[PDB]
Amino acid sequence: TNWKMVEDRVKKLADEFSTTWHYDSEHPYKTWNYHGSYEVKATGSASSMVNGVVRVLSKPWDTLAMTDTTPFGQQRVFKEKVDTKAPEPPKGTAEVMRVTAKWMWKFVGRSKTPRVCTKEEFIAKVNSHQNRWASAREAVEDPAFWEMVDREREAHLQGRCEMCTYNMMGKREKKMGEFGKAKGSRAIWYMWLGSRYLEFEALGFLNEDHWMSRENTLGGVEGLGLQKLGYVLRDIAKNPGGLMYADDTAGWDTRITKADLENESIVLEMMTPEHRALAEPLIKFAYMNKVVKVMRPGADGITVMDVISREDQRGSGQVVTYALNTFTNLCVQLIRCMEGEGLLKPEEVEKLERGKQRKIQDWLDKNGTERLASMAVSGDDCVVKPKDDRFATALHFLNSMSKIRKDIPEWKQSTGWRNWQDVPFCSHHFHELTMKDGRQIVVPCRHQDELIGRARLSPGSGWSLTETACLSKAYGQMWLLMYFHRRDLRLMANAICSAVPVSWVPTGRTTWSIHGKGEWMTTEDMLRVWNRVWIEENEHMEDKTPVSSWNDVPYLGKREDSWCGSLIGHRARSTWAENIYTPIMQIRGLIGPERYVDYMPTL
Ligand SMILES: [Zn+2]
Ligand SMILES: [Zn+2]
Numbered sequence: 323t324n325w326k327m328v329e330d331r332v333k334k335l336a337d338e339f340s341t342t343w344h345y346d347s348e349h350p351y352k353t354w355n356y357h358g359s360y361e362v363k364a365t366g367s368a369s370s371m372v373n374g375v376v377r378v379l380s381k382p383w384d385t386l387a388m389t390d391t392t393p394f395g396q397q398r399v400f401k402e403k404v405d406t407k408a409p410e411p412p413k414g415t416a417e418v419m420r421v422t423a424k425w426m427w428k429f430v431g432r433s434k435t436p437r438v439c440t441k442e443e444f445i446a447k448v449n450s451h452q453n454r455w456a457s458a459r460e461a462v463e464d465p466a467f468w469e470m471v472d473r474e475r476e477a478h479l480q481g482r483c484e485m486c487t488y489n490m491m492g493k494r495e496k497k498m499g500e501f502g503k504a505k506g507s508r509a510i511w512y513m514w515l516g517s518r519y520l521e522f523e524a525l526g527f528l529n530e531d532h533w534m535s536r537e538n539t540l541g542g543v544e545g546l547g548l549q550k551l552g553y554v555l556r557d558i559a560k561n562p563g564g565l566m567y568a569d570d571t572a573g574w575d576t577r578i579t580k581a582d583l584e585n586e587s588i589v590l591e592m593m594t595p596e597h598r599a600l601a602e603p604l605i606k607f608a609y610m611n612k613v614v615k616v617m618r619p620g621a622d623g624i625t626v627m628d629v630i631s632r633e634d635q636r637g638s639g640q641v642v643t644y645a646l647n648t649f650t651n652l653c654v655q656l657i658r659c660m661e662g663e664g665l666l667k668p669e670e671v672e673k674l675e676r677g678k679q680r681k682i683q684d685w686l687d688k689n690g691t692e693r694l695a696s697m698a699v700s701g702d703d704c705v706v707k708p709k710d711d712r713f714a715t716a717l718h719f720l721n722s723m724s725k726i727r728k729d730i731p732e733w734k735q736s737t738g739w740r741n742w743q744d745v746p747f748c749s750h751h752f753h754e755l756t757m758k759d760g761r762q763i764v765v766p767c768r769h770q771d772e773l774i775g776r777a778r779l780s781p782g783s784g785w786s787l788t789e790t791a792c793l794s795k796a797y798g799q800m801w802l803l804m805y806f807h808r809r810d811l812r813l814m815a816n817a818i819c820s821a822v823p824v825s826w827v828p829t830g831r832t833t834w835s836i837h838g839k840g841e842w843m844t845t846e847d848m849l850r851v852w853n854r855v856w857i858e859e860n861e862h863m864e865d866k867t868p869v870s871s872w873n874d875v876p877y878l879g880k881r882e883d884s885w886c887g888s889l890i891g892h893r894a895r896s897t898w899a900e901n902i903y904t905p906i907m908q909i910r911g912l913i914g915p916e917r918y919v920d921y922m923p924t925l
Pocket of ligand 2: 753768769882886
């Protein structure tokens, strides 16, 4: 019965594709109300090409379905993950969420004030990493494009919305898990570029002004690269409290309740009316009443496009998806801390006690800063060090908020970690190492099979040798900067760089995490970049003496490296390393004549 909100958007699609627009009574949508369907050509594929460069240089890992833009792929993820409704919080829980959100918004806005983002900033982003136009940069250079933005912006000021419709492109696996980089059914969403700017214009200040940064929220890690994250966990462990907990919420984006949207939407109260006049219509029309285009398999070998709507979820493609998820997750963990400390009873979920609203405010006013400082929240990933170990059994308000934990019974006690180095965070754990010179360094680490698996695969077909070589070099230089402590990766990274020409600039996408800042994507010597990253820019390195050679860069212990998937000690690797020059030359022959550098002697 939300037809009025989504009336204009559906009709525009229906009118534009009226020659094929129709109604399909056999649609499988359950939690989405279905409007109509029109025919489209099949877009995308399920072909994941193997990286020949990485393949020949990782022969022992030959023993070691990924990204489905196919219309069959889009429907499968929608049927299993997207098409669901998270239960709304009860009355008592909602007040707790509302009080926490108000306190957090006032806290995160203590020094920063909301502002409107200009098109010049948006033009800066598109130039720095389509139906009529064929390029994003070409569109922003067209005055006709900005007219479409203006007319749609005028509609928002008039209380209307016509073009802010989402596109369900398909699936992109969330994690690289068991092996081969295959885990997670994450849904990727695309939206029109004009709507992207209007969203950026109204809510871009959350990202551009770093509202979720650690110096602002005290619990967020926004803007911190993977190198900085390790020291954060060690610093949290220095604080008093109990064990460290890192619980994943299964389908977090699909479990964003309508109360969560409302609680995040009270930032408009901190904005100027002129700014609110632009942001208020957008949140109501784009987030709170979505219009989504999904391809569905059809009969006679034809593909069809559906138009549907809902009210609650998070689009996962919203420009402030990460920032809003960090805000709500920080609120969720703070609420669970209150239940663990006895402030919130399991019965107060249905109805809060008499004075337990100002008392919650009192607890946040006193313990909010201290509790947040012992948290590390990146989107839906979280690490919390609570006051005591009663936090493990404080599952009532957590499950009431539909933030059900992943791969665990609903009411089974959560288990914490005794050593901060074992705590998972952003698909990584962190090891503490002592260098040859005696200095200590905290490094990110994850199972080696996951790292090799993603490099071996390339998105789509039609890859040239030059393109797939630069992507391989990007993986190799990334390994040297982040995973230098892994013996197999360091040897394999040099092998790629020895096989790939020196002058070639690395390209491609080697990481999906927002914490991958791509310092490895330069042609500068990685040893020089390594000194800048881990010594010069390292706030936890008082002694700024630079490292003079790669041999001074430490490895993990053979016990800790073997535990995390290294193939040292196996006969297969011993042969692989001894004869590593043979695969290097084969790639050089295939590429052709060029200038190269041999990096094996540096090992
Ligand atoms: Zn709109
Ligand atoms: Zn490890």
